Design a protein around this nucleic acid. Structure first.
Ligand code: K
Ligand code: MG
Ligand code: MG
Ligand code: MG
Length: 154
RNA sequence: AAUUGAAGAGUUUGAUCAUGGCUCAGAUUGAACGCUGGCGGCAGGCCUAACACAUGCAAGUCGAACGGUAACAGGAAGAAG
């Protein structure tokens, strides 16, 4: 599995004494072949937070039906305030996406894609929107299956 | 063969998500200014005062329309070193 650290953030809660700082780590993991998951870890230290995130990511992986390291069709993904658009691209396009979407698409095994993040670009929600977009993407076979047709008829 | 094409980031908070403005990375120019400055090719060069303008030049040509002959170049006559 390829692993990527998207974001580390210092968060704080107040107590009687003062402030207690801690760290959050957002990570994605993927096999580079249409399997991808994200993880979010919290700890008092940065490396502990990353380790927790990576462990979470490995167990929460979903399957994406790719085509030649690009998408099957244009997809929209939404989570919270994040709305993402992703489109299939030709070979040699590369990942034309912002960093959070790029990390997801790279480990998933999407080599060629045109993307755009609308609304909030908060990494935590962009990653959820992106994976939401990918996981509800249909291949021609499942479309043919559900409609009760052959793939050439589709 | 001839529309293969779309990236985000910083900043409100003790921290958060959202909302929302401000700001930045790009491309561009009849540019200007600062520092610096070797050569070439190709292009470009009053965006303001349609303000005022010295001087030179930017519209002539035809004798195969015409009377002519001021030039000067021949030609013919008539005479002087
Ligand atoms: K903003
Ligand atoms: Mg959770
Ligand atoms: Mg916004
Ligand atoms: Mg502060």
């Amino acid at each position: 599995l390829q692993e990527k650290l998207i974001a580390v953030n210092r968060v704080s809660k107040t107590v009687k004494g003062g402030r207690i700082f801690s760290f959050t780590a957002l990570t994605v993991v993927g096999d580079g072949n249409g399997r991808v998951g994200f993880g979010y870890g919290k700890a008092r230290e940065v490396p502990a937070a990353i380790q927790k995130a990576m462990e979470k990511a490995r167990r929460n992986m979903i399957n994406v039906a790719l085509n030649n390291g690009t998408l099957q069709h244009p997809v929209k993904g939404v989570h919270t305030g994040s709305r993402v658009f992703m489109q299939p691209a030709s070979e040699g396009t590369g990942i034309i996406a912002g960093g959070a979407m790029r990390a997801v698409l790279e480990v998933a095994g999407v080599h060629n894609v045109l993307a755009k993040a609308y609304g909030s670009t908060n990494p935590i929600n962009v990653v959820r929107a992106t994976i939401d977009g990918l996981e509800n993407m249909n291949s021609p076979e499942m479309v043919a299956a559900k409609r009760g047709k052959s793939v050439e008829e589709i």
